[PDB]
């Protein structure tokens, strides 16, 4: 019930990698850049954006496991350990890969979004594969 990994990573990665500089991404059939506030897993019950949440469910659903190499690992580690509020959960293996189990409230960011989708599209689509 969202965009396609391939494009997802494309738009999300295009903003973060050069437009948002690792910020919060808004989802809803498209990806947007959030710099005003931020996030913290919040499910909009406190003071978050329905976007982040949705993006979290979409980025978490698409992955549902993936494998995250060394990059995606440091990826979540960065966006997660960046500020605070533990929302993403991770476990490493794959020699140089890790498994992404994340949530702890529904709210995602541009980086985190691209992170899981990097491993998502990587292991799932990879330049559109499904």
């Amino acid at each position: 019930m969202n965009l396609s990994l391939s494009d997802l990573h494309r738009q999300v990665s295009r903003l973060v990698q050069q437009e948002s500089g690792d910020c919060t991404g808004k989802l809803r059939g498209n990806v947007a850049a959030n710099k005003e506030t931020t996030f913290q897993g919040l499910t909009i019950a406190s003071g978050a954006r329905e976007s982040e949440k949705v993006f979290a469910q979409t980025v978490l659903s698409h992955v549902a496991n993936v494998v995250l190499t060394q990059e995606d690992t440091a990826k979540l580690l960065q966006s997660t350990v960046k500020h605070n509020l533990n929302n993403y959960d991770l476990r490493s293996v794959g020699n140089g890969n890790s498994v992404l189990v994340s949530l702890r409230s529904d709210q995602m960011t541009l980086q985190d979004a691209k992170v899981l989708l990097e491993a998502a599209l990587r292991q799932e689509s990879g330049a559109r594969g499904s």
Binding site: D7, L8, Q11, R28, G29, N30, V31
Partner: peptide
């Protein structure tokens, strides 16, 4: 609906 095109 939401936005037309992403990116």
């Amino acid at each position: 609906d939401e936005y037309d095109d992403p990116f």
